[PDB]
C-alpha cells in the first residue's frame, strides 16, 4: 500500500551489493551485521547454515563448490549467453532444462543430496539477506525498493530481477540505470546547483566497466552514449598483483610450485591481492602475506603505490581508452565534457582519477575523492541514488510509476543545435544548450553597448567546433531580430528564449519589453 | 539566470519592424531529435506530473 511502504535503495552488482535509505532527505548507506557497506554478492552454505556477504566470501577457499558468486548478470539469461569465467573458482553454472542452475549442498545432513537451484532462486535467497539486514537496522520490515541496473539489461533480465525480488517478499517500485543513480546522488544533495552539463559517468567495477555520457538539462538526464567492457576492471587489477607476488614467491623459493596452478593457493591469492589493492588506495605502501600459501610455505612481502601503478599501467590505459571511446561515441570531444563522475569500487584508485584529469581540460570537474573536495565515496553513488529515487516515489501508486516510465512521458524532442544571441565588440552567447529536451526556458544577462540606446538582439543558431585544441562556437542560421529602445549606459539587457513542445520559439528581451514568436 | 560579460550590438540606423520584432527563421523537425530521458529525479517526476 502506498501510504505504508518502507522503502530502501538497492544496488545489486556481480561483485558487491549495498543498501541505503534517506534520513531528512539525505541518502545514507546502511552497514549490515558484519559492518559492511559494500556487501559481497556471494552466497555459501556450511553445515546447513546460509552465509552471505563477507562471511560467504571467506568460504571461497575452504568451501568453493558450495559457494555461489558472480551471478547477477546470469539472471534472466539463456545458458548459451552465460560467461562462466568468474564462476570457475566456485559453483559452476550449468544447464538444466531452459534454466541456469547451480548444484550445491545447502542441507545439514552430511549424506544428503545436493540441491539444484536456479539462478533466480539464488538471487531471491540473497535479496532476502540484503533486505533482512536493512530491516534489522531500520527496526521496521522493508517492503519496497528501487534497484539500479546496467543500461544493457535485457527486458528478460528485468523481469527475472523483479520476479526474484517478489519471491523475496520485496516489491520493486522502479528499476533505474546505474549511471543515472550516480548522477542523482550528486544532484539531489542540498548544496548541489542544477545547470546544463555534459556528464561522463565512469563506472569502474569488479567484473565489468561501464562509461556513460549524459546530457543534463533542467535537472533531467538523457543518455547520449554508453560503452561496456569486461576485460579492464578491478579483477584485472587483482591479476597484476597476483602475478607480481607469485613471481616474487617463486624467486624467493626456488623449486616450489606455482601458487597460480593450485586452486586453493590461487583463492588465497585473490583475497589478499584485493586487500592489498584497497590498501594502496588509502596508503602509499601496503603489505601482502599469506600464511601457508603452498607446500606449507608462508609468504610475506610489500609493494608501494608507485610500483603498483607501473605494473598496472596497461589496465589503467584500458580505462582511459574506455572514456575516450564513449565521448567519441557521442560525437563529442573531451572539451565538450563538464563533469566526470567516477563510480564503482575501482574508481577509488588515485591514479585513475589523475589520468582522467590529464584527458580532460582543467575546466572539466573530476568528481573523485582525490581530485575534488566535494566528492562522494565512489562505492556509494548507486545505492544513494536508488534511495533518493525510492524516497521520491514511495507515496506513488503502482499505476502512476508505470505510466511515468512509458515512452509517451520519457520521449520528447531534443534541440540539436544551440539557440543564442550574437555579441559584437568594436561572439555567440549560448542561451539554449545543444541537446536540450523541450519544453525548456533559459535566460541570460548581457552587457549593453558603451552608451547603449537602441540595441540589437539577434537570436541565432550555434554549433561547437574544435580548432587546433580549443572549442569555439560557430554562428549558423538566424532565427529572429528584436530591438530594445534607449538602453541605459552600463545597463544589462536580459534575453530569454522559450521552446515549446510544438518547437515554437518565444523570444523576450526586456532590460531591468519586446516579445516575439517563431512558429 | 546566467550573467555574461559580453556586449550586445548597437542597432543600425534605419531599422524597424512591427513591435520592434522581425521573425526570420524557425525550428524544424530536422533540427531536433527524439531522445529518451532517464525517469529519475524530482524534476522528471514534475515533468511526468504535467504530462499526465
Ligand atoms: N578502495 C578501493 N580501491 C581500489 N579498488 C577497490 C576499492 N574498493 C573496492 N575496490 C574494487 O572494486 C571492485 C568492485 O567494485 P563494485 O563493488 O562497484 O563492483 P560491482 O558492480 O559490485 O561488481 P561488478 O562490477 O562485477 O558488477 C572490486 O574489484 C574491488 O577490488
Ligand atoms: Mg556495478
Residue numbers in the entry:
A (entry chain A): 9 to 434, 439 to 480, 523 to 566, 571 to 577
B (entry chain B): 3 to 54
Which passages does the manuscript contain on this structure?
We now determined the structure of an N-terminally extended RAC core comprising CtSsz1 with the complete CtZuo1N (residues 1–60 of CtZuo1) at 2.5 Å resolution. The structure has been solved by molecular replacement using the previous RAC core as a search model. The Ssz1-NBD adopts the typical actin-like fold of Hsp70s, which is divided into two lobes (I and II), with ATP and Mg2+ bound between them. The domain arrangement is as before, with the Ssz1 linker detached from the Ssz1-NBD creating a loophole for Zuo1N and with the conserved Zuo1 EPVG motif contacting the Ssz1-NBD at the linker binding site. In contrast to the previous structure (Ssz1-Zuo1N19–60) in which Ssz1 β8 was disordered and its position taken by Zuo1N β117, Ssz1 β8 is now structured and aligns with β7 of the lower sheet. Second, the N-terminal extension of Zuo1N contributes two additional β strands (β0, β1) to Ssz1-SBDβ resulting in a β-sandwich with two mixed, 5-stranded β sheets. Zuo1N β0 complements the lower and β1 now the upper sheet of Ssz1-SBDβ, aligning with Ssz1-SBD β3 and β5b, respectively. Notably, Zuo1N Phe23 inserts into a hydrophobic pocket between the upper and lower β-sheet of the Ssz1-SBD. A third insight gained from the Ssz1-Zuo1N structure was that a conserved region (SLPLPTL, termed LP-motif) present in CtZuo1N between β0 and β1 binds to the RAC–SBD in a substrate-like manner. Notably, the Ssz1-bound LP-motif adopts an almost ideal poly-L-proline type II (PPII) helix, which resembles the binding mode of proline-rich antimicrobial peptides, while the DnaK-bound NR-peptide adopts a more extended conformation.
